[PDB]
Design a protein around this ligand. Sequence first.
Ligand code: GMP
Length: 316
Amino acid sequence: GDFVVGMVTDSGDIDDKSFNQQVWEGISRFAQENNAKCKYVTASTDAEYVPSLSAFADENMGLVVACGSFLVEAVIETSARFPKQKFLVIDAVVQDRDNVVSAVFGQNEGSFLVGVAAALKAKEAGKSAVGFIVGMELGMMPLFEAGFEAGVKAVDPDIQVVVEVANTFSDPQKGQALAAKLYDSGVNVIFQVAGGTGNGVIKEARDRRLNGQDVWVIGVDRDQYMDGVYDGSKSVVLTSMVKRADVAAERISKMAYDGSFPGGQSIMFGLEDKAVGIPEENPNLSSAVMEKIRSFEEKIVSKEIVVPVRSARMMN
Ligand SMILES: Nc1nc2c(ncn2[C@@H]2O[C@H](CO)[C@@H](O)[C@H]2O)c(=O)[nH]1
């Protein structure tokens, strides 16, 4: 009765206020705007990856959407078994499948911009270290730290980045504990790239500011500014590294619907396409800081500056 987009997620959370929420929102906008339909299924564990993708393929859906490094092996295999079913993979890369489109993000480029913001706010307080909490380091995840570090160093090479890995995108309790550890060490800015776990980092930041500690957090995926309001007016969210996974999902769903699915291609959503970067409006960033950020942004887009894909501590 309808063209249907089916999302298989490795997370039991489309309300994660970040990544899975953006993807579902994009699929949902596509369906609403095109008189189509959509649904999703959660595949918490590995053993459910193959059967989950297979069931949607057996329903002859218009498009099957899968995200992350946990689902890619299952997509690689399943796409070969169902050559006539279209699949979209987000945050991972598939080769040799003309029925699969891979959407990847230049998140190192966007993270460079928030690194500049972090370094400037840290210097403002005489701090020589900033924090970074990442959900997991598999797949393309290392791009965030690589760009964040590069942006921090572009402002001041002596500022150190202190990294904590949660090893989960669905544990806010862990997010708060890791944020507490960083703030307790004297850091005043933390960039969180941790999906649902990240909501706990934002909570810890709100709790600290509420009681007079001058701390900040930089959000991810969505413009998380309102998520950090702690006293009725002010927010602890310095800025956010926005990643338009919603636009990628919406646009490719439309191409599938229209017969122009770019099967077999990897599509890069970057700073020049405005698919990553910072929000258009940033109450906590001054005009001076914004001009500095915009300046670096232009040098990255033109390639005058190329942002690394791996941080210094991860390079030989
Ligand atoms: N595989 C996977 N990646 C996620 C999830 N949540 C967040 N991420 C990744 O972590 C980044 C920051 O939230 C997102 O842009 C994604 O790259 C999740 O539930 N599963």
